[PDB]
Amino acid sequence: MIKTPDEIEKMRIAGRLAAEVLDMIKPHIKAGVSTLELDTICRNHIENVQHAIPACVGYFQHSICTSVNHVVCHGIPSENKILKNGDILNIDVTVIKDGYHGDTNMMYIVGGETSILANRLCKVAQEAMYRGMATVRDGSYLGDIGHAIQKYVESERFSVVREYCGHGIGTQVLHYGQAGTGMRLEAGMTFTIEPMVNAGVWQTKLLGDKWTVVTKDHKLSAQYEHTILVTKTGIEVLTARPEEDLS
Numbered sequence: 001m002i003k004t005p006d007e008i009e010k011m012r013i014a015g016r017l018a019a020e021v022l023d024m025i026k027p028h029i030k031a032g033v034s035t036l037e038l039d040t041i042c043r044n045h046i047e048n049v050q051h052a053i054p055a056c057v058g059y060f061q062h063s064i065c066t067s068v069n070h071v072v073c074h075g076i077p078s079e080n081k082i083l084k085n086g087d088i089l090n091i092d093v094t095v096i097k098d099g100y101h102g103d104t105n106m107m108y109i110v111g112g113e114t115s116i117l118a119n120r121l122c123k124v125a126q127e128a129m130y131r132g133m134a135t136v137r138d139g140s141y142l143g144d145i146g147h148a149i150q151k152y153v154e155s156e157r158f159s160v161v162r163e164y165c166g167h168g169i170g171t172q173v174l175h176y177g178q179a180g181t182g183m184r185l186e187a188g189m190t191f192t193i194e195p196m197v198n199a200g201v202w203q204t205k206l207l208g209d210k211w212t213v214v215t216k217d218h219k220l221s222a223q224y225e226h227t228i229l230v231t232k233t234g235i236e237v238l239t240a241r242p243e244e245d246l247s
């Protein structure tokens with residue numbers, strides 16, 4: 001599962017392009033915008049400016065997932081989903097370039113202001129991802145990631161969605177368990193770390209469209225995602241954004 005130098009170089013490019021989607025879409029996020037409009041802007045950027053491939057061509061009909069509020073993941077862009085101030089929005093994107101892909105998602109607070117709880121949920125979700133990323137280096141264990149995430153999130157009185165906290169990435173599902181469990185990590189491995197944090201119960205449900213996932217209790221959910229490369233001394237965050245403080 002060790003990526004070659006050529007494979008890693010192509011993943012750096014794709015990861016940077018994916019990061020660029022999440023940064024460039026920011027000024028378009030305001031009250032009154034539909035999530036379909038965001039999808040079209042991202043599709044045009046990926047295909048026609050980056051000259052890359054959005055996920056709807058690789059292995060449905062949209063270039064991004066737009067998950068609002070109680071939607072946990074896989075929200076479908078829609079002309080009828082109109083953002084309003086105080087909404088929390090996750091945009092999830094995969095960019096494919098030259099056979100390799102970069103995967104990342106982040107939260108946006110529509111209008112810059114939201115409730116005490118929604119702000120805290122987003123910040124805890126981002127810090128949870130970072131805590132999981134902080135365990136990773138050559139010789140660490142896959143289980144260290146989920147353990148760090150779950151311990152932190154529950155200490156903050158939120159719930160972790162139990163389906164997964166990450167996946168192998170290339171072209172393996174990361175679960176919550178005990179530290180020291182799972183595969184020992186080696187420099188050159190790549191995967192995503194993407195914990196989903198619910199304000200209420202950890203249970204989710206799939207909507208009638210067999211695609212959109214929502215919290216079981218209709219409370220808020222937040223997620224962040226990075227694609228990471230394992231190194232001898234730590235990680236390289238392939239989807240890091242330039243103004244993103246990784247300390």
Ligand code: NA
Nearest residue numbers: 068069071221
């Ligand atoms: Na959500």
